[PDB]
C-alpha cells in the first residue's frame, strides 16, 4: 500500500472524490468531524454521519472507500447535479452541515477558524467626502486567470482598484451620483486557503476552458496583500492540494495531488488508485487530454503543525466506532 486509501468511482460524483481527500487530510477538520455529537442521527439523511463514515473508512479500510450513502445524503441525484454545481458549492454544503452540527459542542467553530477570513470592500468618492466600508467574510477565493500568469498577478488583479465613471457612477445618495473608486483589500487570511482558479469564459453557446499557463508556487507569501501585515505571523502559505481536471473534448476526469503531511512528499489520488509522484508532476506539470489545474489549497506556515495534527485511531469515539462497524455487519449479510 501507500498508507492512504482511495475512493471508488461510484457515479457522476466528479470533483467529489477530490474534495473528500482534501478535507480528509485537513487533519484538524477531520478530528473535529470525528468528535461531533452525531449519536442518534438517521443514517439515510445525515450528512455529518455520512462524512464521519467516509473519513473512518478512509482511515482504517485497506480497500477503496464507497461514497454512495453520502451522495444520497445531500441529495445531488439529478443527471446534471454535479456538473451544474461548483466545487465551492459542494464544499459549502458539507462544511455548513458539519459546522452546524458542531454548534453547542466543545469543538464548535472549527470550520470558521480554519477556512474563514476577514475582508473589506470599499467604495470611495473622489470629489465628494464620502466612503462606504463594509466587512465581508469568505471561505474561498475565486481567482482570475485570463491575462494573469501566476498567483501573484492574480492577487494583484483582485486588489486592483475598479473605477466607477459615468454610466456606472456610484449612487452616493445624499451626494448624488459620483465618480468613485471601488475595491477590496485583505484584512486576514485563514489557516487553510481554498483558491479556485477561474479558467473559463463565455459566441457559440458554451463555457469553454482557458487552457492557458498559470503558475502557482509551493510557498505563497501574501503579506503584501494584507492591509496591515503582522510580524511574528507573516502571511506565508505552503501548497497542500492541487485539484486537477483532464480535458479531452467532452471527457472530464477529476484527480487531486496532495502532500498530506505538508512535507513535500506528494501523492496522486486517482480515485481508488493512490500512488507516489514527483513534486514536478504535482506543481510544475499542472501549470498548463488537456490537463488543467482549477483549485489550490494552501496552509499557513505558522498553522501547519496544528492544521496537520497527528490523528490516531483512539481520536474516534468508541460509540462512533460501534455504530459504523454495526452498519458494515449489516451489509456483509
Amino acid at each position: 500500500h501507500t498508507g492512504y486509501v482511495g475512493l471508488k468511482n461510484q457515479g457522476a460524483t466528479c470533483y467529489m472524490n477530490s474534495l473528500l481527500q482534501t478535507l480528509f487530510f485537513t487533519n484538524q477538520l477531520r478530528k473535529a468531524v470525528y468528535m461531533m455529537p452525531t449519536e442518534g442521527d438517521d443514517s439515510s439523511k445525515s450528512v455529518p454521519l455520512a462524512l464521519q463514515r467516509v473519513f473512518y473508512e478512509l482511515q482504517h479500510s485497506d480497500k477503496p472507500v464507497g461514497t454512495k450513502k453520502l451522495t444520497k445524503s445531500f441529495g445531488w441525484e439529478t443527471l446534471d447535479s454535479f456538473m451544474q454545481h461548483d466545487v465551492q458549492e459542494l464544499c459549502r454544503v458539507l462544511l455548513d452541515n458539519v459546522e452546524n452540527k458542531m454548534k453547542g459542542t466543545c469543538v464548535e467553530g472549527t470550520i470558521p477558524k480554519l477556512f474563514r477570513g476577514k475582508m473589506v470592500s470599499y467604495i470611495q468618492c473622489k470629489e465628494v467626502d464620502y466612503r462606504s466600508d463594509r466587512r465581508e467574510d469568505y471561505y474561498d477565493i475565486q481567482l482570475s486567470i485570463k491575462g494573469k500568469k501566476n498567483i501573484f498577478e492574480s492577487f494583484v488583479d483582485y486588489v486592483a482598484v475598479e473605477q466607477l465613471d459615468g454610466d456606472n457612477k456610484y449612487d452616493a445618495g445624499e451626494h448624488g451620483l459620483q465618480e468613485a473608486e471601488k475595491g477590496v483589500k485583505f484584512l486576514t487570511l485563514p489557516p487553510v486557503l481554498h483558491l479556485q482558479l477561474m479558467r473559463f469564459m463565455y459566441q457559440t453557446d458554451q463555457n469553454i476552458k482557458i487552457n492557458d499557463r498559470f503558475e502557482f508556487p509551493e510557498q505563497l507569501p501574501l503579506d503584501e496583500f494584507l492591509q496591515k501585515t503582522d510580524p511574528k505571523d507573516p502571511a506565508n502559505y505552503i501548497l497542500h492540494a492541487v485539484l486537477v481536471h483532464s480535458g479531452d473534448n467532452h471527457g472530464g476526469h477529476y484527480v487531486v495531488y496532495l502532500n498530506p503531511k505538508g512535507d513535500g512528499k506528494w501523492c496522486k489520488f486517482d480515485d481508488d488508485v493512490v500512488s507516489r509522484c514527483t513534486k514536478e508532476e504535482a506543481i510544475e506539470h499542472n501549470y498548463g487530454h488537456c490537463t488543467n489545474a482549477y483549485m489550490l489549497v494552501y496552509i499557513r506556515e505558522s498553522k501547519l503543525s496544528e492544521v496537520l495534527q497527528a490523528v490516531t485511531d483512539h481520536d474516534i469515539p468508541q460509540q462512533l466506532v460501534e455504530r459504523l462497524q454495526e452498519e458494515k455487519r449489516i451489509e456483509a449479510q
Binding site: 454535479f82 456538473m83 451544474q84 461548483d86 475565486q142 453557446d205 458554451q206 463555457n207 473534448n249 472530464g252
Partner: peptide, 13 residues
Amino acid sequence: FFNFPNXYRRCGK
C-alpha cells in the same frame, strides 16, 4: 466550475 465544456451559467456565481 470546473466541469467544462458545458452550456450551464450557474458556474461561478
